[PDB]
PDB file of N, CA, C and O in Angstrom:
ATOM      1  N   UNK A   1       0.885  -1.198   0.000  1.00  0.00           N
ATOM      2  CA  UNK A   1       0.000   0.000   0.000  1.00  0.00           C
ATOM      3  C   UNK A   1       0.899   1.217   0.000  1.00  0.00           C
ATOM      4  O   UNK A   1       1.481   1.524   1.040  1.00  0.00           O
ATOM      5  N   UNK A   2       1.039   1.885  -1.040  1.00  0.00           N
ATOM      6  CA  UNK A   2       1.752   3.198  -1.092  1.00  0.00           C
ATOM      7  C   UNK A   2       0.871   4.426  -1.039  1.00  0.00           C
ATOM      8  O   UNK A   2       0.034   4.399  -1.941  1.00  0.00           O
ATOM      9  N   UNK A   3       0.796   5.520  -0.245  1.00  0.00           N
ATOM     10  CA  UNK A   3      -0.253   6.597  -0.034  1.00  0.00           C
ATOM     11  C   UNK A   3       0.906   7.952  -0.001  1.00  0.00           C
ATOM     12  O   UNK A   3       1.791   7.961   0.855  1.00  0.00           O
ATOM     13  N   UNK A   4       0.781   9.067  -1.025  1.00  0.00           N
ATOM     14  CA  UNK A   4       1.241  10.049  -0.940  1.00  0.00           C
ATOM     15  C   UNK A   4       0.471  11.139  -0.646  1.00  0.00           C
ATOM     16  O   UNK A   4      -0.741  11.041  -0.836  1.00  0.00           O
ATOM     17  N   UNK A   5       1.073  12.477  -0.087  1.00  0.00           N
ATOM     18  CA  UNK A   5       0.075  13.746  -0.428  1.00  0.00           C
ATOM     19  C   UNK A   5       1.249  14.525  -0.327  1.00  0.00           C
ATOM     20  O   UNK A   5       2.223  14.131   0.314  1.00  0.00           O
ATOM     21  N   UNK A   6       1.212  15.757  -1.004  1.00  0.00           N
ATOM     22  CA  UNK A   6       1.712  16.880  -1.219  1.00  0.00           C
ATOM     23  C   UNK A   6       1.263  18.361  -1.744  1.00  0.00           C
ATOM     24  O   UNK A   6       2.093  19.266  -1.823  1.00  0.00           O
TER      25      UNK A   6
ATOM     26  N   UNK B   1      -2.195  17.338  -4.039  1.00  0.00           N
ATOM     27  CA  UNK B   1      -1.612  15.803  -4.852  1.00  0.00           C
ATOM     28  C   UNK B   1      -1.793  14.800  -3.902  1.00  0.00           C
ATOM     29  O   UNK B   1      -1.226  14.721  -2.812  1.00  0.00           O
ATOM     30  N   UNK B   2      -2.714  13.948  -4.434  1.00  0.00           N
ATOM     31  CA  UNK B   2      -2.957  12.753  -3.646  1.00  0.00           C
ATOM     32  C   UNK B   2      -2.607  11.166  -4.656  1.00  0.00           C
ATOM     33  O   UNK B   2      -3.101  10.936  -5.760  1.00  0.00           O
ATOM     34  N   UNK B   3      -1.881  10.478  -4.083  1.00  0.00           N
ATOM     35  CA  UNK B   3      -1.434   9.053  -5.317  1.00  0.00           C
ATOM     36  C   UNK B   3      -1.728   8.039  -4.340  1.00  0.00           C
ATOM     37  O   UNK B   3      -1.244   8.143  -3.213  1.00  0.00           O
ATOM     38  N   UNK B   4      -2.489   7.042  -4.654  1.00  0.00           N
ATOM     39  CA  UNK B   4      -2.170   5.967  -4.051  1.00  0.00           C
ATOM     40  C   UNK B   4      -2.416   4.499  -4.969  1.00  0.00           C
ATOM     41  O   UNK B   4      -3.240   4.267  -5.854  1.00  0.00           O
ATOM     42  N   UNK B   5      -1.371   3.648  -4.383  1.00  0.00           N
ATOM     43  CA  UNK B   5      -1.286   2.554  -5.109  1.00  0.00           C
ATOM     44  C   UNK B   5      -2.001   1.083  -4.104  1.00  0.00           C
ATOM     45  O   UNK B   5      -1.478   0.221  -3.398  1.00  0.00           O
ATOM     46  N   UNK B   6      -2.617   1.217  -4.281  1.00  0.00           N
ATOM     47  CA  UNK B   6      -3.066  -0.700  -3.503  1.00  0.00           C
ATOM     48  C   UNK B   6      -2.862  -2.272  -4.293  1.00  0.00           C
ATOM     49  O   UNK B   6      -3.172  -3.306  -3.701  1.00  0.00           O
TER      50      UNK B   6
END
C-alpha cells in the first residue's frame, strides 16, 4: 500500500 | 496531490 500527499 | 497505489 503506497499513499502520498503533497 | 494525492497518489495511491493498492
Amino acid at each position: 500500500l503506497f499513499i502520498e500527499w503533497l
